[PDB]
Tab-separated table of C-alpha atoms and ligand atoms in Angstrom:
chain	number	residue	atom	x	y	z
A	905	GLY	CA	-87.150	86.556	-125.435
A	906	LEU	CA	-83.509	87.099	-126.594
A	907	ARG	CA	-84.546	86.018	-130.295
A	908	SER	CA	-87.679	86.055	-132.384
A	909	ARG	CA	-89.714	83.022	-133.194
A	910	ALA	CA	-88.528	83.363	-136.855
A	911	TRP	CA	-85.025	83.288	-135.672
A	912	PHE	CA	-85.633	79.989	-133.844
A	913	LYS	CA	-87.441	78.517	-136.864
A	914	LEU	CA	-84.299	79.046	-139.112
A	915	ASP	CA	-82.060	77.789	-136.297
A	916	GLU	CA	-84.074	74.534	-136.245
A	917	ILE	CA	-83.829	74.271	-139.956
A	918	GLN	CA	-80.082	74.886	-139.874
A	919	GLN	CA	-79.865	72.015	-137.360
A	920	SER	CA	-81.850	69.691	-139.495
A	921	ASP	CA	-80.477	70.690	-142.986
A	922	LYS	CA	-77.069	72.314	-142.579
A	923	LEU	CA	-77.628	75.094	-145.133
A	924	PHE	CA	-75.281	77.729	-144.063
A	925	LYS	CA	-71.567	77.653	-144.078
A	926	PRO	CA	-68.726	80.106	-143.414
A	927	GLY	CA	-68.300	82.780	-146.127
A	928	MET	CA	-71.444	82.118	-148.263
A	929	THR	CA	-73.402	84.871	-150.017
A	930	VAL	CA	-77.083	84.686	-149.069
A	931	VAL	CA	-80.246	86.348	-150.467
A	932	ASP	CA	-82.960	87.079	-147.737
A	933	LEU	CA	-86.450	87.784	-149.023
A	934	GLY	CA	-89.022	89.303	-146.601
A	935	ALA	CA	-86.151	90.055	-144.136
A	936	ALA	CA	-87.791	92.538	-141.655
A	937	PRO	CA	-87.233	92.717	-138.749
A	938	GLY	CA	-84.069	90.800	-139.256
A	939	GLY	CA	-84.171	87.605	-137.374
A	940	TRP	CA	-83.042	85.313	-140.284
A	941	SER	CA	-80.258	87.642	-141.403
A	942	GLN	CA	-79.127	87.931	-137.816
A	943	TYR	CA	-79.100	84.093	-137.507
A	944	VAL	CA	-77.382	83.658	-140.892
A	945	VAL	CA	-74.553	86.071	-140.106
A	946	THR	CA	-73.670	83.943	-136.987
A	947	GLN	CA	-73.194	81.022	-139.459
A	948	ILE	CA	-71.600	82.580	-142.508
A	949	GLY	CA	-69.463	84.790	-140.348
A	950	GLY	CA	-67.870	88.307	-141.045
A	951	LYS	CA	-66.578	87.146	-144.466
A	952	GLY	CA	-69.919	86.052	-145.797
A	953	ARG	CA	-72.665	88.470	-146.726
A	954	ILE	CA	-76.496	88.839	-147.286
A	955	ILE	CA	-78.521	90.754	-149.797
A	956	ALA	CA	-81.828	91.273	-148.020
A	957	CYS	CA	-85.239	92.816	-149.046
A	958	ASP	CA	-88.487	93.820	-147.321
A	959	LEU	CA	-91.356	96.209	-147.898
A	960	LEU	CA	-90.614	97.515	-144.343
A	961	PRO	CA	-87.470	99.233	-143.112
A	962	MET	CA	-85.291	97.395	-140.638
A	963	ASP	CA	-82.317	97.875	-138.373
A	964	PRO	CA	-79.007	97.728	-140.189
A	965	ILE	CA	-76.832	94.630	-139.724
A	966	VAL	CA	-73.113	94.538	-140.541
A	967	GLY	CA	-72.699	92.199	-143.524
A	968	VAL	CA	-76.202	92.656	-144.757
A	969	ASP	CA	-76.997	94.842	-147.760
A	970	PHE	CA	-80.582	95.643	-147.156
A	971	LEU	CA	-82.968	97.245	-149.662
A	972	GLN	CA	-86.336	98.386	-148.675
A	973	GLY	CA	-88.789	97.784	-151.495
A	974	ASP	CA	-91.578	95.688	-152.949
A	975	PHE	CA	-90.164	92.485	-154.222
A	976	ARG	CA	-92.925	92.301	-156.853
A	977	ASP	CA	-91.616	95.366	-158.551
A	978	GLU	CA	-88.970	94.470	-161.264
A	979	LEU	CA	-87.190	97.741	-160.423
A	980	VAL	CA	-86.561	96.409	-156.932
A	981	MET	CA	-85.356	93.112	-158.460
A	982	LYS	CA	-82.949	95.100	-160.558
A	983	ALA	CA	-81.522	96.829	-157.481
A	984	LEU	CA	-81.215	93.592	-155.626
A	985	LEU	CA	-79.233	92.142	-158.557
A	986	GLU	CA	-76.932	95.184	-158.411
A	987	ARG	CA	-76.068	94.311	-154.879
A	988	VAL	CA	-75.457	90.610	-155.642
A	989	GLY	CA	-73.259	91.567	-158.625
A	990	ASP	CA	-71.046	88.729	-159.762
A	991	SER	CA	-70.908	87.110	-156.185
A	992	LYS	CA	-72.083	83.489	-156.494
A	993	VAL	CA	-75.201	83.013	-154.299
A	994	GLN	CA	-75.135	79.763	-152.340
A	995	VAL	CA	-78.562	80.092	-150.486
A	996	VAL	CA	-81.798	82.014	-151.216
A	997	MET	CA	-83.984	82.107	-148.191
A	998	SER	CA	-87.615	83.516	-148.190
A	999	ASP	CA	-89.848	84.058	-145.197
A	1000	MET	CA	-92.199	86.308	-147.304
A	1001	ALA	CA	-95.880	86.231	-146.343
A	1002	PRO	CA	-98.579	88.660	-147.480
A	1003	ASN	CA	-100.832	90.614	-145.340
A	1004	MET	CA	-103.497	88.086	-144.470
A	1005	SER	CA	-107.327	88.814	-144.996
A	1006	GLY	CA	-108.209	85.618	-143.090
A	1007	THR	CA	-109.834	84.004	-146.139
A	1008	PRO	CA	-107.839	81.226	-147.665
A	1009	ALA	CA	-109.117	81.519	-151.204
A	1010	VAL	CA	-107.628	84.941	-151.193
A	1011	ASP	CA	-104.589	84.597	-149.010
A	1012	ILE	CA	-103.162	81.489	-150.575
A	1013	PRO	CA	-103.055	83.149	-154.060
A	1014	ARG	CA	-101.423	86.294	-152.512
A	1015	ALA	CA	-98.835	84.090	-150.820
A	1016	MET	CA	-98.225	81.831	-153.710
A	1017	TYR	CA	-97.448	84.675	-156.022
A	1018	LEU	CA	-94.559	85.695	-153.659
A	1019	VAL	CA	-93.093	82.311	-153.531
A	1020	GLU	CA	-93.217	81.878	-157.193
A	1021	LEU	CA	-91.313	85.152	-157.539
A	1022	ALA	CA	-88.788	83.786	-154.980
A	1023	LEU	CA	-88.404	80.634	-157.012
A	1024	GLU	CA	-87.911	82.702	-160.183
A	1025	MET	CA	-85.121	84.489	-158.416
A	1026	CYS	CA	-83.544	81.123	-157.557
A	1027	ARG	CA	-83.549	80.243	-161.347
A	1028	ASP	CA	-81.809	83.558	-162.163
A	1029	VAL	CA	-79.205	84.003	-159.265
A	1030	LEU	CA	-78.911	80.713	-157.275
A	1031	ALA	CA	-75.624	78.989	-158.091
A	1032	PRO	CA	-75.679	75.326	-159.084
A	1033	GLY	CA	-75.439	73.206	-156.068
A	1034	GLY	CA	-77.084	75.873	-153.999
A	1035	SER	CA	-80.120	75.847	-151.634
A	1036	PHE	CA	-83.468	77.445	-151.168
A	1037	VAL	CA	-85.596	77.636	-148.071
A	1038	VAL	CA	-88.934	79.000	-148.383
A	1039	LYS	CA	-92.112	79.606	-146.206
A	1040	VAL	CA	-95.106	78.105	-148.065
A	1041	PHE	CA	-98.747	77.557	-146.780
A	1042	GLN	CA	-100.577	74.267	-146.937
A	1043	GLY	CA	-103.406	74.065	-149.473
A	1044	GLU	CA	-104.059	75.341	-152.923
A	1045	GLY	CA	-100.942	75.491	-155.065
A	1046	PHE	CA	-98.742	73.626	-152.641
A	1047	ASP	CA	-98.459	70.367	-154.664
A	1048	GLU	CA	-97.595	72.238	-157.891
A	1049	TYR	CA	-95.073	74.418	-156.150
A	1050	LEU	CA	-93.288	71.449	-154.470
A	1051	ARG	CA	-93.257	69.753	-157.965
A	1052	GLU	CA	-91.655	72.901	-159.555
A	1053	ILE	CA	-89.070	72.992	-156.812
A	1054	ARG	CA	-88.345	69.235	-157.059
A	1055	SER	CA	-87.622	69.762	-160.803
A	1056	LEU	CA	-84.976	72.450	-159.986
A	1057	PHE	CA	-83.206	70.801	-157.096
A	1058	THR	CA	-81.698	67.394	-156.098
A	1059	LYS	CA	-83.147	66.923	-152.642
A	1060	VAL	CA	-86.354	68.501	-151.325
A	1061	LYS	CA	-87.713	68.188	-147.727
A	1062	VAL	CA	-90.898	69.686	-146.198
A	1063	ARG	CA	-90.160	70.979	-142.680
A	1064	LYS	CA	-92.403	71.964	-139.784
A	1065	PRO	CA	-90.145	73.624	-137.315
A	1066	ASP	CA	-91.000	72.902	-133.663
A	1067	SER	CA	-90.936	76.748	-133.234
A	1068	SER	CA	-93.471	77.026	-135.922
A	1069	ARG	CA	-96.980	77.303	-134.295
A	1070	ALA	CA	-98.689	73.972	-134.736
A	1071	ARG	CA	-101.841	76.094	-135.489
A	1072	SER	CA	-100.192	77.843	-138.346
A	1073	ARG	CA	-100.581	76.255	-141.906
A	1074	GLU	CA	-97.023	77.204	-142.680
A	1075	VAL	CA	-94.321	74.694	-143.568
A	1076	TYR	CA	-90.757	75.370	-144.788
A	1077	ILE	CA	-89.613	73.749	-148.012
A	1078	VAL	CA	-85.957	73.050	-147.912
A	1079	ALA	CA	-84.360	72.334	-151.242
A	1080	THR	CA	-80.658	71.492	-151.748
A	1081	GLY	CA	-78.443	70.719	-154.847
A	1082	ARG	CA	-79.751	73.219	-157.310
A	1083	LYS	CA	-79.467	71.417	-160.727
A	1084	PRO	CA	-77.298	72.570	-163.454
B	2349	LIG	C1	-92.658	86.442	-141.632
B	2349	LIG	S1	-92.126	88.219	-141.826
B	2349	LIG	C2	-90.335	87.831	-142.081
B	2349	LIG	C3	-89.516	87.646	-140.749
B	2349	LIG	C4	-88.000	87.427	-140.968
B	2349	LIG	N1	-87.765	86.160	-141.513
B	2349	LIG	C5	-87.175	87.628	-139.645
B	2349	LIG	O1	-86.603	86.728	-139.292
B	2349	LIG	O2	-87.320	88.873	-139.026
B	2349	LIG	C6	-92.584	88.490	-143.557
B	2349	LIG	C7	-92.116	89.642	-144.191
B	2349	LIG	O3	-92.491	89.511	-145.668
B	2349	LIG	C8	-92.470	90.950	-146.155
B	2349	LIG	N2	-93.114	90.868	-147.455
B	2349	LIG	C9	-94.310	90.600	-147.879
B	2349	LIG	N3	-94.607	90.826	-149.096
B	2349	LIG	C10	-93.382	91.516	-149.567
B	2349	LIG	C11	-93.061	91.998	-150.750
B	2349	LIG	N4	-93.835	92.105	-151.789
B	2349	LIG	N5	-91.781	92.470	-150.829
B	2349	LIG	C12	-90.967	92.399	-149.906
B	2349	LIG	N6	-91.206	91.914	-148.597
B	2349	LIG	C13	-92.507	91.401	-148.535
B	2349	LIG	C14	-93.319	91.712	-145.036
B	2349	LIG	O4	-93.107	93.213	-145.042
B	2349	LIG	C15	-92.951	90.930	-143.795
B	2349	LIG	O5	-91.907	91.668	-143.006
């Protein structure tokens, strides 16, 4: 197809939640191969920009400052913050997912650690009034994580994009209005 399933999932979320506007600065976590950043550039336009990160390398995209590295490493976090600089960040988007073993009691904790790191980054860099979109899996830790997100944002919705495989346990938490 012309675009990836991931690109279509974000397009569906943009349609339901209107997260991306012209000129915004966006952080893209777990960006490879680049569908979400590709999609967001069409919305924020040439004057907006994205600071992206993934363990894997990916094709460059004009307007996207991409840093290959392990988001769990504080050194990588520091380098991402050097790319954000004093730019106000209006949206943090995370599609990070760990390598899956196939065993829930192992995969869920692995995944939950990554989304907790994404939320912590929201606390530090997401501007007041900003948004967060994050891939989360159903099951252990979901309730507590949604609660943590609801305490940091004004409105929170749980989305299951039509393009998201009904067989997959993923959902996308879409939070808006980051609190002061
Ligand atoms: C679902 S794919 C992302 C697809 C992306 N949204 C797109 O549109 O192309 C998830 C990605 O998360 C990344 N990931 C997982 N753990 C990570 C970590 N510790 N640091 C950075 N990226 C990580 C992977 O390497 C994998 O590329």
